[PDB]
Amino acid sequence: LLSGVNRHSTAIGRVWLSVIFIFRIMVLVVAAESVWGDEKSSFICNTLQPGCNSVCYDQFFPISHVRLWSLQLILVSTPALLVAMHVAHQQHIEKKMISGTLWWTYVISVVFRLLFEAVFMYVFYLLYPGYAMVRLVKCDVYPCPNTVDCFVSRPTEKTVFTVFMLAASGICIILNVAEVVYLIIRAC
Amino acid sequence: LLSGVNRHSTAIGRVWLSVIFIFRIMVLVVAAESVWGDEKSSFICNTLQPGCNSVCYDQFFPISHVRLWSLQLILVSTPALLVAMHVAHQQHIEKKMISGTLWWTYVISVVFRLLFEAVFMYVFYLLYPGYAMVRLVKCDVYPCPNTVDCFVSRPTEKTVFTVFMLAASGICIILNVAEVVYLIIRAC
């Protein structure tokens, strides 16, 4: 399951990480179509040149925030689901017919989840510097003549939801670091 | 009358100047509404901002070529008409009841006509450098956002007529200089 457990997960990996993951899922569900639903259609530019709106939008939004967060959530949930599948497979094999291997697998899964969180946060920072979206953008790309003034839709609400998602991801990274440190200390 | 005579006008002031003046009048008549008729309406810009076309047109055409040439022709014809009126007044006075004063008046009239020709040519050069009109103009003036691409109507035909009018005005200036020099030489 999401942020799955393996009989080795502590309190900060069984109680808090699952809550944060569910919170992110619910926020993404309630903001996916309400806020970013008309990101493309409501996006208009101040020009008479045909085809300038689409090229400007693709220039300023290479990949939307909602879909980037969706990919981040899917890739974060993948290692936990893989670990759960492996645990079920091992149980089935034992029934048809070990703790240290499971412990190391869980540690590697937490490490990979932390790595995915960090890389997705870095990608988000690289694509969209800052936490705020501006109402007006200046675009100079073919076929738009010189510079044109495009207007983004709902910058303030998108900024609020971006702050929420970034804070949640930072909390997830902190909790993953704490979980890794706690497991290392307990093992030694 | 136009480029009027005063019994003192030579061959280059009675035969050629009148022909050039009539040629300019006819060219202006046949090009006033045919070419510059839709200079404002056909003038369009590549923007969705309301009111940008009018401000751009006023920016790039402070005063149209046709009306500038009309003012030049009126001011050039004014001294000749004034001299003719003065001659008629003197004839009426003599009938109711002198050559040197008339000669000096004619010389001053030719000088003033030359001065008006020169000043109008200089003004035309200052407002519109070069002899050619371009199809595309870049305009950055309020309320137009940044720079906009405006398109002029009939640049080639207007260039041809500008060349015609400038050549005619240059010929007029040369003939006026020749007339002044010839009168000065004959007097001395």
From Swiss-Prot, chains A, B:
Consequence the record notes for mutating C56F: In CMTX1; moderate
Principal location: membrane
Impact noted for substituting R14G: In CMTX1; non-functional channel
Effect of S77C: In CMTX1; mutant have a higher open probability than hemichannels formed of GJB1 wild-type
Effect listed in the UniProt record for changing N176S: In CMTX1; mild
Phenotype when changing M26T: In CMTX1; functional channel; localized in the Golgi apparatus without reaching the cell membrane
Family designation: Belongs to the connexin family. Beta-type (group I) subfamily.
Protein name: Gap junction beta-1 protein
Portion held of the full protein: 9 to 217 of 283
